[PDB]
C-alpha cells in the first residue's frame, strides 16, 4: 500500500520550481509535504538523491546556511546544476508516464537522456534504462517500429553481462508484444518461445507467466483457439497472477476465448470471476470489457454492447476497441446479419484511424 513514486517526483519538481522563484512559503510547504511521504514512497535511490539536492539548494536560498553564506555561484554550482536538471526532467517524464501522457513522457525522457551523457561515469545500464522507458512509451501509443528499436538497444546492453538476465528478459517481453501488435504473428511466436526457454532456464516466475499469456494472445490472433486456450490456463496456473490486476487480462481472455468456441458453460465461470476482479481492483475497463461478453453471449443486447464499447473509446483504448468491434463484426456475419456486421466493421475501421492520429497533443 505504498504511494506511487512518480507522484512524489512531481512534488519534488514543484518544490524545485518554487526555489527558482525564491518563494519561501511554497517551498517550505512542499518541503514538509515531501519529507512526510519519502519513506512511504516505493523505495527509489533517485528520489532521495533529488531530495537532498533540492534540500541543499533550499538552504542556499532561504536558510542562509544559518545567516552566513556566499553568493550561490561557485565551483560545485555547475555540477549540482546539471544533476538537478537531469532529475527534474526524468521525474517530469515519470509523472507523465504515470498519467498515461506518453508523448509528453517521451519528450522529457529524451531531454533527460541527453543530459545523462554529460554526467561523469554514468554506467551503461542507466542508458539501457532510458532506451527501455522510451520504447515502452512508444509501444503504449502503438509506434511499434521505434519501440522495437529502443527496446532492443536496451536489450543489447543488458545482454552484455551476467547480472542483468532479468532485465534483458523484460526487454524481450516488450519486443515480443510489439511483434504481436504489429501482426507479425509467426515471428512473435518464435520470439516468445525463445524467451520462455530463457525464463524457464533461470526460473523467473512473472516472465514465464507473461510469456504464456502473450503466447495465448498470439494463437488467439492466429485463429488457433484450442492452443490459445491451452496457454491462457498455463498462465493462470501461476499463483501470483490471481492477485495482481494484470490477472484481469488472463481471466478476461479465458472468458472471451471460451465463449468464442461453443463453451458458454465454462465461459460464464470466468465472466463471473472477471467481474469480481473488476471492481476488486476498480477496473472499469474490464467491467466494460466483460459486460460486452455478457451482452454478446448471455442474454444479448446490441444497444448495450455499443455503449460499453463507447466507454472504451472515451478511454482511448483504440487498439482494443478495434479488435473487439472486429470480432462483433465477424459474429454477426457468422449469424447472417450483415447490416450490423457491416456496422461494426465500419466501427473497427474508424478505431484503426484513431490509433494513427494519437489521442494526445503534440508541440
Amino acid at each position: 500500500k505504498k504511494v506511487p513514486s512518480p507522484y512524489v517526483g512531481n512534488l519534488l519538481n514543484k518544490w524545485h520550481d518554487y526555489i527558482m522563484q525564491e518563494k519561501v512559503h511554497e517551498s517550505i510547504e512542499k518541503r514538509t509535504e515531501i519529507k512526510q511521504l519519502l519513506s512511504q514512497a516505493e523505495d527509489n535511490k533517485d528520489l532521495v538523491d533529488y531530495f537532498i539536492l533540492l534540500d541543499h539548494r533550499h538552504s542556499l536560498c532561504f536558510d542562509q546556511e544559518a545567516s552566513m553564506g556566499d553568493v550561490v555561484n561557485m565551483l560545485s554550482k555547475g555540477s549540482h546544476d546539471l544533476l538537478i536538471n537531469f532529475y527534474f526532467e526524468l521525474f517530469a517524464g515519470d509523472y507523465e508516464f504515470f498519467k498515461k501522457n506518453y508523448v509528453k513522457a517521451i519528450s522529457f525522457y529524451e531531454k533527460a537522456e541527453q543530459k545523462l551523457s554529460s554526467i561523469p561515469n554514468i554506467e551503461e545500464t542507466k542508458f539501457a534504462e532510458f532506451h527501455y522507458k522510451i520504447g515502452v512509451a512508444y509501444y503504449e501509443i502503438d509506434q511499434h517500429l521505434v519501440s522495437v528499436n529502443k527496446v532492443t538497444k536496451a536489450r543489447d546492453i543488458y545482454k552484455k553481462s551476467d547480472m542483468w538476465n532479468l532485465e534483458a528478459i523484460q526487454c524481450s517481453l516488450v519486443v515480443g508484444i510489439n511483434l504481436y501488435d504489429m501482426g507479425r504473428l509467426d515471428d512473435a511466436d518464435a520470439y516468445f518461445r525463445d524467451a520462455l526457454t530463457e525464463a524457464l532456464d533461470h526460473g523467473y516466475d512473472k516472465p514465464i507467466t507473461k510469456i504464456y499469456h502473450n503466447l495465448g494472445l498470439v494463437h488467439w490472433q492466429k485463429g488457433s483457439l484450442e492452443l490459445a486456450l491451452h496457454y491462457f490456463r498455463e498462465a493462470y496456473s501461476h499463483e501470483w497472477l490471481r492477485d495482481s490486476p494484470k490477472g484481469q487480462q488472463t481471466v478476461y481472455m479465458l472468458s472471451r476465448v471460451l465463449y468464442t468456441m461453443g463453451q458458454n458453460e465454462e465461459a460464464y465461470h470466468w465472466y463471473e470471476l472477471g467481474i469480481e476482479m473488476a471492481r476488486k481492483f476498480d477496473d472499469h475497463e474490464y467491467k466494460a470489457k466483460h459486460d460486452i461478453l455478457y451482452h454478446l453471449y448471455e442474454q444479448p443486447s446490441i444497444d448495450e454492447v455499443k455503449q460499453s464499447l463507447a466507454f472504451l473509446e472515451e478511454r482511448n483504448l483504440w487498439p482494443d476497441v478495434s479488435k473487439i468491434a472486429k470480432g462483433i463484426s465477424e459474429l454477426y456475419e457468422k449469424k447472417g446479419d450483415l447490416v450490423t456486421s457491416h456496422e461494426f466493421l465500419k466501427r473497427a475501421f474508424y478505431a484503426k484511424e484513431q490509433i494513427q492520429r494519437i489521442t494526445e497533443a503534440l508541440g
Binding site: 516488450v174 508484444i177 501488435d181 499469456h213 488467439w220 482494443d320
Partner: peptide
Amino acid sequence: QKGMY
C-alpha cells in the same frame, strides 16, 4: 487485446 509485460 494488447499484451502484458
